[PDB]
Nucleic acid binder design. Structure first.
Ligand SMILES: [Mg+2]
Ligand SMILES: [Mg+2]
Ligand SMILES: [Mg+2]
Ligand SMILES: [Mg+2]
Ligand SMILES: [Mg+2]
Ligand SMILES: [Mg+2]
Ligand SMILES: [Mg+2]
Ligand SMILES: [Mg+2]
Ligand SMILES: [Mg+2]
Ligand SMILES: [Mg+2]
Ligand SMILES: [Mg+2]
Ligand SMILES: [Mg+2]
Ligand SMILES: [Mg+2]
Ligand SMILES: [Mg+2]
Ligand SMILES: [Mg+2]
Ligand SMILES: [Mg+2]
Ligand SMILES: [Mg+2]
Ligand SMILES: [Mg+2]
Ligand SMILES: [Mg+2]
Ligand SMILES: [Mg+2]
Ligand SMILES: [Mg+2]
Ligand SMILES: [Mg+2]
Ligand SMILES: [Mg+2]
Ligand SMILES: [Mg+2]
Ligand SMILES: [Mg+2]
Ligand SMILES: [Mg+2]
Ligand SMILES: [Mg+2]
Ligand SMILES: [Mg+2]
Ligand SMILES: [Mg+2]
Ligand SMILES: [Mg+2]
Ligand SMILES: [Mg+2]
Ligand SMILES: [Mg+2]
Ligand SMILES: [Mg+2]
Ligand SMILES: [Mg+2]
Ligand SMILES: [Mg+2]
Ligand SMILES: [Mg+2]
Ligand SMILES: [Mg+2]
Ligand SMILES: [Mg+2]
Ligand SMILES: [Mg+2]
Ligand SMILES: [Mg+2]
Ligand SMILES: [Mg+2]
Ligand SMILES: [Mg+2]
Ligand SMILES: [Zn+2]
Lengths: 127, 83, 61, 206, 60, 97, 23, 155
RNA sequence: AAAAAUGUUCUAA
RNA sequence: CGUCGUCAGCUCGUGCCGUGAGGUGUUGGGUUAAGUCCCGCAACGAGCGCAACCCCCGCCGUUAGUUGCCAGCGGUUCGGCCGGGCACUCUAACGGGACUGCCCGCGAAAGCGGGAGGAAGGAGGGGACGACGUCUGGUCAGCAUGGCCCUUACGGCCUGGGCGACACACGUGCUACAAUGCCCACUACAAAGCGAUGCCACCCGGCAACGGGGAGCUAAUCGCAAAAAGGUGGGCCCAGUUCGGAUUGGGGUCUGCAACCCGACCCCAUGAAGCCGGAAUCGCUAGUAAUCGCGGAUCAGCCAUGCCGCGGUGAAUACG
């Protein structure tokens, strides 16, 4: 009666709950499209069940805290895919090759002393 | 400026000089190191010798300089320009 | 409120009184330098105006 | 000059702190200054004993200075009277309950701080500096250590042109963290000036 | 003008404003950390010595 | 019957935690296992050199690890025994109702 | 403009508050 | 690069048209990371081209891009001590990228106020072989035709 | 198959 | 401590060659980010370096469940709030995990190319780590220290002044020249840190800095807290402007014994230069650059647009 996937991306954690239903999505009690309103990277967070024709097959009850709105998006993308194999493991092919089962570890590189950001350097002026 | 919750600032010792001079039928030369003291209406007519760090510059105080500190009339930097 | 021409009278006469009494800001407004504690080694270009470039010290050969 | 201090580099892997205790923000320094004031006192008093490492523990109103010394007998004095002349003068500075303990060191020539002081004392008695280095490194290898390096910087033999001298036997991997490397420095001070004595004893990887 | 200044720094001032911190170990008046009573140099020396309880070279 | 332990060394903080929750696990009832509260890290970034060399530092940090231990029922057979326990040096204990 | 203390943007840049960045 | 080539970064197809070409384009509109702003600009322009001359805009967009791809461009070489204008053909990758670059670039030249109008109107002109990004592409191809004498210096 | 001149005195530790 | 230079190097013991300096080894074939490995060889080993061990980040586990968390039943002033629970998220310690281990191909080998599994693959990303030495590099002003020098003074206290000067010149930056923008209002999503004459919830005063009240918090509990770009809605309409916020007049706020020289801030007014910058020149190869905000050290206050960190959004291109 319930299927779960954990989505992590860039300090943004996601607890997505795949439950059967007409298709509706919720995020932190707010509806999806009320939460990522006018954020065109919206539908990428649901693309998992576009490679597995379950768009309207599940409702989803999602939670995200930390990171940022797009950081949560790829975390929702990862959990929705994570829950689908947790629903059935036959789904793994058509999900793993499409990069859905992997978690991109691209995090902000730490600032380093003598520099202005991770690698941006103070302007060189010989004399 | 000095927060007017607190008063207007005289070092108290320089004030003693002002009013000791008032009650005596002033004036007299008033040397001071209190550039940080406000000009106060009891000073008009006096000539207060202000120390710029080097010399004690005299300053005759008129009614139209009461809002200011005494160091505004003894400048600390000799300049003359470049040439 | 007092405006256009009149306002500028009370601005001018105030600066005037600053220069008249010998206030340090009056010395500042005389020589046309900053009055609010800014440094003048570099910049102050608004208050001083276009750079009157001069020759400099010479290195040895 | 470009080399990390081998102890600071290892603290938490090979090396435990000389002073270990907890203290909140409001009196970390007070406990630190009292320790610095204690260690100096003993590093002045127990210098004639061959003091190698002062351990200072702290809990509540009582400080437990476990001092490590080559010759413990010259510290304790007569059956515990010099140890008592200090267990008191320590408490006179501690104000607390000063627990002063003495510890036997296995082989002093396996103690980098000691050897560093010996070479420092030797070139204070105007010895051959180069020879004093080869002498030292040798005593350490004999004493079983897996490697030793001894460095002297300064006006070696009073020469106006200052200079570094060193020797090393066995391995001394300074970049290896599992390598137990006792570091010790002693400062030689002579008529012509001041000289630096760095001792690196490889005890063996763990 | 060091020792008299390591001394005067201690002595309680005429005004709390003149209160400035000063290293306990070397007497440096700049880059002095409240937490240790030391300066940034002495901080590095005592640390490397292991005489600074609980502080290690950070990396991340 | 709450007890919170602090210290810089986390190795001793953990052995000084389990030595407590193993104690009150002698005279029951239950204890609430040692939760690790978040570490409070105090950094220090100082110039590596004593002079002028600004763009080269060395990072240090002071780690103040945190553990909480709760013994659910009082039972004075440990509210006497815990006082007879051996907690290492760099461990500070706070015990609350 | 961050340099404009007279707007919400300038008060954010100096991290101060006022009629132009009310808290 | 010195050791090996650069591996061309593959982009995620955009969520409206499913096109990597749209994505690279929106990335060329983007400044300071404000992608969604650049997403709105490309998409609000996509509407306008579906209005003015009602056509499937993705087809118009790909006619602009196609009509801006430069097939040749001069490049400097060396032999002895020279720095010629060597006419060398353009790799299909650099073909696309110069288009996308000059597209946005010449579009931002245009005088209409808001961006999507500037983007839409250039893609309308460039899909018909007019406007800035064309006059640049054609001009580049012109200079290469000129220096066809230094073509024997092609590697 | 090569656009472009020069570097004060003693000391080289 | 900087530097060359995270560059792949620098050497030693013995043996061999050479009258000797010195040579060999350390060269040569291939390979690697690497003197990295392999093969060869009058060389055979060794050491300082390189890699590794260590720290953060990415996947899973184990042990943990309050101050953290709420999946599901119970209530519910509808706020995880109370029952209860630790599943999840998390917090934080200990583990596991990738080894070119597997396949195909090449190869003498080392490896290299590609494919599989996998969260991760070729050193996964980032840090810490800097060889022999070089620059008579830097620091006697952090400290130490030899010598030279001063001794009612070159020592010491104090008050004021100066380190903030300004015809000029350079370096590093902050803010801009605008519409992919500016402005008001509403509305979202961070991490890392700090906090007991400390952080200040909330309340009234004030246009506002702030003031006065006034809880909580020795802090996964109370607070700093608003994150901002963003989203939504409206205004401006190409103007030296609703761009820009310098300069200056006035009016205050606070810290402080004291803001004249010489503090920050707040309100009214003022509203400069600047329409994208000559010769020339800098940084960056990916969660980088670019942009956006946040915190800390020092600190009464603060001239911080600086420094060290933190996350948000997030590109372009590498033929060679
Ligand atoms: Mg984390
Ligand atoms: Mg960033
Ligand atoms: Mg000035
Ligand atoms: Mg001194
Ligand atoms: Mg002070
Ligand atoms: Mg200080
Ligand atoms: Mg710098
Ligand atoms: Mg801006
Ligand atoms: Mg020539
Ligand atoms: Mg000549
Ligand atoms: Mg030989
Ligand atoms: Mg021979
Ligand atoms: Mg030889
Ligand atoms: Mg060989
Ligand atoms: Mg050789
Ligand atoms: Mg070589
Ligand atoms: Mg060689
Ligand atoms: Mg050779
Ligand atoms: Mg390398
Ligand atoms: Mg290494
Ligand atoms: Mg559990
Ligand atoms: Mg020199
Ligand atoms: Mg000296
Ligand atoms: Mg000195
Ligand atoms: Mg200065
Ligand atoms: Mg200039
Ligand atoms: Mg700046
Ligand atoms: Mg500049
Ligand atoms: Mg602070
Ligand atoms: Mg704040
Ligand atoms: Mg104007
Ligand atoms: Mg103009
Ligand atoms: Mg305007
Ligand atoms: Mg404005
Ligand atoms: Mg004013
Ligand atoms: Mg001032
Ligand atoms: Mg314009
Ligand atoms: Mg430009
Ligand atoms: Mg690189
Ligand atoms: Mg401050
Ligand atoms: Mg200023
Ligand atoms: Mg700041
Ligand atoms: Zn110091």
């Amino acid at each position: 009666e319930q299927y779960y996937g954990t989505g992590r991306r860039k300090e943004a954690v996601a607890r997505v709950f795949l439950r059967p239903g007409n298709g509706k999505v919720t995020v932190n009690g707010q509806d999806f499209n009320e939460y990522f309103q006018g954020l065109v990277r919206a539908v990428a967070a649901l693309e998992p069940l576009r490679a597995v024709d379950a768009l309207g097959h599940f409702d989803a009850y999602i939670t995200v805290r930390g990171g940022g709105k797009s950081g949560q998006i790829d975390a929702i993308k990862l959990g929705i895919a994570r829950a689908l194999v947790q629903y059935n493991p036959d789904y793994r092919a058509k999900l793993k090759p499409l990069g859905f089962l992997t978690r991109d570890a691209r995090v902000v590189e730490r600032k380093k002393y003598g520099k202005h950001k991770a690698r941006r350097a103070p302007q060189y002026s010989k004399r | 400026p000095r927060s007017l919750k607190k008063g207007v600032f005289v070092d108290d010792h320089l004030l003693e000089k002002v009013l000791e001079l008032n009650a005596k039928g002033e004036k007299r030369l008033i040397k001071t190191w209190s550039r940080r003291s406000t000009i106060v209406p009891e000073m008009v007519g006096h000539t207060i010798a202000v120390y710029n760090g080097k010399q004690h510059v005299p300053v005759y105080i008129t009614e139209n300089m009461v809002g200011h500190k005494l160091g505004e009339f003894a400048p600390t930097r000799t300049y003359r320009g470049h040439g | 409120w007092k405006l256009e021409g009149e306002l500028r009278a009370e601005v001018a006469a105030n600066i005037k009184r600053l220069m008249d009494i010998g206030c340090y800001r009056g010395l500042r407004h005389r020589r046309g330098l900053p009055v609010r504690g800014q440094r003048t080694r570099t910049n102050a270009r608004t208050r001083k105006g276009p750079r009157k470039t001069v020759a400099g010290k010479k290195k040895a050969p | 000059g470009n080399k990390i201090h081998p102890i600071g580099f290892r603290l938490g892997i090979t090396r435990d702190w000389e002073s270990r205790w907890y203290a909140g923000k409001k009196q970390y320094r007070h406990l630190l200054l009292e320790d610095q004031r204690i260690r100096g006192l003993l590093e002045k008093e127990l210098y004639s004993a061959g003091l190698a490492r002062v351990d200072i523990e702290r809990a509540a109103d009582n400080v437990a200075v476990t001092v490590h010394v080559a010759k413990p007998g010259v510290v304790i004095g007569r059956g515990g009277e010099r140890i008592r002349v200090l267990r008191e003068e320590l408490a006179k500075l501690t104000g607390k309950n000063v627990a002063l303990n003495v510890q036997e060191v296995q082989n002093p020539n396996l103690s980098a701080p000691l050897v560093a002081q010996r070479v420092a004392e030797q070139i204070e008695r105007r010895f051959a500096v180069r020879r004093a280095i080869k002498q030292a490194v040798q005593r350490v290898m004999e004493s079983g250590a897996k490697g030793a390096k001894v460095i002297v910087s300064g006006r070696i033999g009073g020469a106006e042109q200052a200079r570094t001298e060193w020797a090393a036997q066995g391995r001394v991997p300074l970049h290896t963290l599992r390598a137990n490397i006792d570091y010790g420095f002693a400062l030689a001070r002579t008529t012509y000036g001041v000289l630096g004595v760095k001792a690196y004893i490889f005890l063996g990887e763990v | 003008a060091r020792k008299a200044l390591i001394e005067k720094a201690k002595r309680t001032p005429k005004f709390k404003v003149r209160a400035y911190t000063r290293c306990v170990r070397c007497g440096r008046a700049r880059s002095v950390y409240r937490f240790f009573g030391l300066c940034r140099i002495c901080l590095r020396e005592l640390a490397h010595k292991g005489q600074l309880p609980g502080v290690r070279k950070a990396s991340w | 019957i709450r007890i919170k332990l602090r210290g810089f060394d986390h190795k001793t903080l953990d052995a000084s935690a389990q030595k407590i929750v193993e104690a009150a696990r002698r005279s029951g009832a239950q204890v609430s296992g040692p939760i690790p509260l978040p570490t409070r890290v105090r950094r220090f970034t100082v110039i590596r050199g004593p002079f002028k060399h600004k763009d080269s530092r060395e990072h240090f940090e002071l780690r103040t690890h945190n553990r909480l231990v709760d013994i659910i029922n009082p039972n004075r057979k440990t509210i006497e025994q815990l006082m007879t326990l051996d907690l290492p040096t760099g461990v500070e204990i706070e015990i609350k109702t | 403009g961050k340099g404009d203390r007279r707007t919400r943007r300038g008060k954010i840049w100096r991290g101060t508050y006022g009629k132009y960045r009310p808290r | 690069a010195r050791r090996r080539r650069a591996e061309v970064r593959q982009l995620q197809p955009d969520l409206v048209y499913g096109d990597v070409l749209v994505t690279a384009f929106i990335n060329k509109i983007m400044r300071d990371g404000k992608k969604n702003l650049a997403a709105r600009i490309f998409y609000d322009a996509c509407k306008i081209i579906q209005e003015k001359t009602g056509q499937e805009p993705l087809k118009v967009f790909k006619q602009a891009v196609e009509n801006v791809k430069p097939r040749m461009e001069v490049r400097s070489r060396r032999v002895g001590g020279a720095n010629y204008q060597v006419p060398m053909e353009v790799s299909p990758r650099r073909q696309q990228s110069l288009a996308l670059r000059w597209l946005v670039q010449a579009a931002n030249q245009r005088p209409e106020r808001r961006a999507a109008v500037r983007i839409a109107h250039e893609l309308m002109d460039a899909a018909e072989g007019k406007g800035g990004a064309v006059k640049k592409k054609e001009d580049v191809e012109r200079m290469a035709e000129a220096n066809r004498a230094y073509a024997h210096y092609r590697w």
